[PDB]
Design a protein around this nucleic acid. Structure first.
Ligand SMILES: [K+]
Ligand SMILES: [K+]
Ligand SMILES: [K+]
Ligand SMILES: [K+]
Ligand SMILES: [K+]
Ligand SMILES: [K+]
Ligand SMILES: [K+]
Ligand SMILES: [K+]
Ligand SMILES: [K+]
Ligand SMILES: [K+]
Ligand SMILES: [K+]
Ligand SMILES: [K+]
Ligand SMILES: [K+]
Ligand SMILES: [K+]
Ligand SMILES: [K+]
Ligand SMILES: [K+]
Ligand SMILES: [K+]
Ligand SMILES: [K+]
Ligand SMILES: [K+]
Ligand SMILES: [K+]
Ligand SMILES: [K+]
Ligand SMILES: [K+]
Ligand SMILES: [K+]
Ligand SMILES: [K+]
Ligand SMILES: [K+]
Ligand SMILES: [K+]
Ligand SMILES: [K+]
Ligand SMILES: [K+]
Ligand SMILES: [K+]
Ligand SMILES: [K+]
Ligand SMILES: [K+]
Ligand SMILES: [K+]
Ligand SMILES: [K+]
Ligand SMILES: [K+]
Ligand SMILES: [K+]
Ligand SMILES: [K+]
Ligand SMILES: [K+]
Ligand SMILES: [K+]
Ligand SMILES: [K+]
Ligand SMILES: [K+]
Ligand SMILES: [K+]
Ligand SMILES: [K+]
Ligand SMILES: [K+]
Ligand SMILES: [K+]
Ligand SMILES: [K+]
Ligand SMILES: [Mg+2]
Ligand SMILES: [Mg+2]
Ligand SMILES: [Mg+2]
Ligand SMILES: [Mg+2]
Ligand SMILES: [Mg+2]
Ligand SMILES: [Mg+2]
Ligand SMILES: [Mg+2]
Ligand SMILES: [Mg+2]
Ligand SMILES: [Mg+2]
Ligand SMILES: [Mg+2]
Ligand SMILES: [Mg+2]
Ligand SMILES: [Mg+2]
Ligand SMILES: [Mg+2]
Ligand SMILES: [Mg+2]
Ligand SMILES: [Mg+2]
Ligand SMILES: [Mg+2]
Ligand SMILES: [Mg+2]
Ligand SMILES: [Mg+2]
Lengths: 97, 66, 50, 87
RNA sequence: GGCGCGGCGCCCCUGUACGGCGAGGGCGCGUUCGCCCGGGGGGCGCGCCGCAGGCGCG
RNA sequence: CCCCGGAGGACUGAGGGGGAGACGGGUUCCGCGGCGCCUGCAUCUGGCCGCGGGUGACUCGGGCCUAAGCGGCGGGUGAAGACCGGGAAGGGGCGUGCCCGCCCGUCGAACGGGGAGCCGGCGGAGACUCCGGCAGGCGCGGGCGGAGACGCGCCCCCCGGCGACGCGCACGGGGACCGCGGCGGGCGGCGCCCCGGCCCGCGAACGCCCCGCAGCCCCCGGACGCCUUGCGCGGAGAGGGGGGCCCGGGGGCGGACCGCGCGUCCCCGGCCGCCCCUGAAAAGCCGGGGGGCCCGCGCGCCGUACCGACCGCACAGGACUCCGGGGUCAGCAGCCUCUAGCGCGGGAGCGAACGCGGCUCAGGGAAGUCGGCAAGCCGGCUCCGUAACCUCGGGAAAAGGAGUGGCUCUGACGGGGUCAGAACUGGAACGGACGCGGGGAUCCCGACUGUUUACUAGAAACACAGCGU
RNA sequence: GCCCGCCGCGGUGCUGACGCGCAGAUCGCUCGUCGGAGCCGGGCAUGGGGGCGAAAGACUCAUCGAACCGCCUGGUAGCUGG
């Protein structure tokens, strides 16, 4: 009933945080009977224990706004917060020329 | 670890400087374990054949492919 | 501290070693009613200065 | 903030264990004990504190040698040995 | 004082729903536009009905 | 059950309620068991209680060196306790007997100096320490080449070197990070669209070969040039042609998937600027001049668990330092977030006064009040336009105006964004949240930046450069 | 020893909260400063009629117009209580 030991042992083998380790709701009686990395390794084999993939952040909208910005969109005076020098330093342009 | 030319390899053999040789199949790697360094040679199997015809009987060679 | 001299280590070790209760067979043998060893200590409320 | 807040800046040891008297009284910076006076050759004793005197003195320890010598004198053969020597 | 729950209609509030089809500066893409459409959504007011509604003490 | 599991909904928001150290604590660590005490509610939870366990080093630190200091020194002084101190016949090599010699501390740094370590794995609790593999350090035993810059055994006296050092806006190079595509493998959803979403594609210390901008040096020869963002350099020998040395780095072979970019952090390089400020020492190791002469074995002692579990009588206080992703953006600001982590003396119902933290209010606009206290107005970016006075540096964002979204296009700079312009369009809207000066005319005091009554006084008080005795 | 502004360092106003506190000095909003007479950590030095002080009689371990601890000391009181 208390399965904090197996959760820490499982995240150790899978090399993941304890938040991304999932146990099959049934077959739980078995997880309770494990106390070693060896017994847990067999459970990750039978598939009773598994690790969820990380959930990154979709960049589809970001890639779209960048495409529009390379076309001249979202870049007028209402969208600029920093000054012209902070956005394009005068010395950088002089050195290039 | 370092790499070696075959004549220096035979110098090492002939003056008993190695403790074990390994053949690795893949161009074949010949791996020689001496006191100081591990020396490696790369030769085609045709040349491995003659190097082992010339292999030393005071010398344990072990094969390896997997 | 993780970086301690052997002398402080040994005096701390003795405090830990002697922080114990009276054996029950000792209570029976010596015919005691007081059964608490009042020289015990607990790390949360102690001020061992060793 | 001269009270409770100032109390939170304490992570130093002022005194440590004395090699002679064993108390938490040896000053780690002045290198001299405030209870028994070590490394002085003589012990720190003051007549304005007889309770301090009684706390650590002759008799609060084992008295092992003196105990044996006194019993030997009072009831054993020691004064006879003295007569044999002083002949 | 056998309540209410849940509907249906009226009446109000907001301001014309998604989608479909057919104008749009421009170079198959396209903000926006017109029609279906005073529409769609919502209700703590008004009117009429499936599930229901009258409890143990003293 | 507030414990455990699954599913959902949220939060902390990389200066973390994350991952780890120093100090302090001292067993709080781990496994099994439990609820008498504690866990201001409960508990089957637990840093609580019982029983067993637990921290492994040639290479990490301590031990050594010296800093600011502290102690010791024939003696000196004082009634003593004790305090003060160079003017003393002050020790070494060996091998007899010679020779050299002026006189302290194996005290003081777990951040300074200091020979030498990387990867993979295994456990309930330990790892740069174990195991396997691969190395490194310190020890002990069986006289030639070149034109040249340069290349290829010791011992004593003296001359030197390394160790060994400030701050700064820039500029340049490497590493890590981060992105955009391709290609391989796997997911998720899917009312319509979707080759448009998500996850994984890894390479150490060490050894050999090559390659390394700036910088310093050699040879020829003898001059209206070379060159940086900035400078700077040359008859005390530039440019051009050919070479040498250093370079915390990179590549190839060992050890053992493919391209292309802006930026961030860290270290390094050559310069330039600054000072009535000029930015430690020693052990240890080495060079010069003069003179005299491969194979084996080993590496002792101490720390190492865990914790903001520390101090405040137990606690919204106090408590040093590492590492630092994405989007918007000038950004280590605010707001949302991947990874990781998830307590905070307990819950339910009602929707009174009053209070505490907030919001909006017609018409007027300081009439309120000791007093505009409190609140509100202003605020980003671009363009326009800016007075008195002044120590000529300022005042200055003075005051005041106008624009700013989305979409479709066009031009300029050598793959990369910036800057400029036009048409169309939307309640007559656009820094749409967030972030973010209200302004002006004067009088008194003190020149200014700075300091202060820890806990009722931040000022006109103190300090200050300057001036004088 | 320039200006806006983050962490940091400080502490203006609300004479706000609290004031049988979260706390024997804290919390919220607002505010000063932010390359310097700047801020922080460890080691070391100065000892009570003495130290240290950009000076407030400030600070010297919740103690300061003279610290704390034990003793002289059951100090003396024409004064208050019993
Ligand atoms: K572009
Ligand atoms: K420890
Ligand atoms: K404690
Ligand atoms: K305080
Ligand atoms: K002392
Ligand atoms: K238990
Ligand atoms: K005398
Ligand atoms: K004296
Ligand atoms: K020492
Ligand atoms: K030292
Ligand atoms: K130090
Ligand atoms: K050290
Ligand atoms: K140094
Ligand atoms: K020389
Ligand atoms: K350890
Ligand atoms: K009520
Ligand atoms: K009332
Ligand atoms: K008024
Ligand atoms: K009035
Ligand atoms: K006001
Ligand atoms: K304005
Ligand atoms: K626009
Ligand atoms: K003043
Ligand atoms: K200033
Ligand atoms: K001032
Ligand atoms: K005051
Ligand atoms: K004040
Ligand atoms: K002030
Ligand atoms: K004033
Ligand atoms: K003052
Ligand atoms: K601030
Ligand atoms: K004040
Ligand atoms: K109030
Ligand atoms: K406060
Ligand atoms: K500033
Ligand atoms: K002094
Ligand atoms: K002092
Ligand atoms: K005093
Ligand atoms: K006193
Ligand atoms: K006393
Ligand atoms: K006395
Ligand atoms: K007295
Ligand atoms: K009197
Ligand atoms: K009196
Ligand atoms: K009385
Ligand atoms: Mg400029
Ligand atoms: Mg001290
Ligand atoms: Mg319509
Ligand atoms: Mg959040
Ligand atoms: Mg535990
Ligand atoms: Mg309770
Ligand atoms: Mg070392
Ligand atoms: Mg060190
Ligand atoms: Mg561990
Ligand atoms: Mg240094
Ligand atoms: Mg550890
Ligand atoms: Mg009035
Ligand atoms: Mg002033
Ligand atoms: Mg005050
Ligand atoms: Mg300034
Ligand atoms: Mg400022
Ligand atoms: Mg009396
Ligand atoms: Mg008295």
């Amino acid at each position: 009933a208390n399965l904090r030991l197996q959760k820490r042992l499982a995240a150790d083998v899978l090399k993941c945080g304890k938040r991304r380790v999932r146990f099959n709701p049934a077959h739980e009686k078995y997880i309770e009977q494990a106390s070693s990395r060896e017994a847990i390794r067999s459970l990750i084999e039978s598939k009773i224990i598994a690790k969820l993939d990380i959930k990154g952040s979709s960049r589809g909208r970001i890639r779209a706004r960048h495409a529009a910005k390379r076309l001249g969109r979202h870049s007028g005076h209402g969208k600029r917060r920093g000054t012209r020098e902070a956005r394009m330093p005068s010395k950088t342009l002089w050195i290039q020329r | 670890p370092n790499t070696i030319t075959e004549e220096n390899l035979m110098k090492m053999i002939a003056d008993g400087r190695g403790k074990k040789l390994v053949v690795k199949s893949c161009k074949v790697k010949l791996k020689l374990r001496t006191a100081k360094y591990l020396y490696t040679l790369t030769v085609p199997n045709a040349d491995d054949a003659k190097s082992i015809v010339k292999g030393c009987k005071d010398k344990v060679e072990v094969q390896y492919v997997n | 501290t993780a970086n301690k001299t052997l002398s402080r280590k040994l005096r701390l070790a003795k405090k830990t070693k002697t922080n114990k209760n009276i054996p029950r067979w000792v209570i029976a043998k010596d015919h005691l009613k007081k059964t608490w060893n009042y020289k015990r200590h607990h790390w949360r409320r102690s001020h061992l200065k060793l | 903030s001269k009270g409770t807040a100032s109390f939170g800046k304490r992570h130093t040891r002022i005194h440590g264990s004395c090699r002679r008297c064993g108390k938490h009284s040896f000053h780690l910076q002045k290198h001299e004990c405030a209870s028994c006076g070590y490394p002085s050759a003589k012990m720190r004793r003051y007549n304005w504190s007889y309770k301090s005197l009684r706390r650590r003195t002759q008799g609060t320890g084992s008295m092992s040698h003196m105990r044996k010598v006194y019993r030997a004198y009072n009831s054993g053969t020691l004064k006879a040995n003295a007569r044999k020597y002083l002949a």
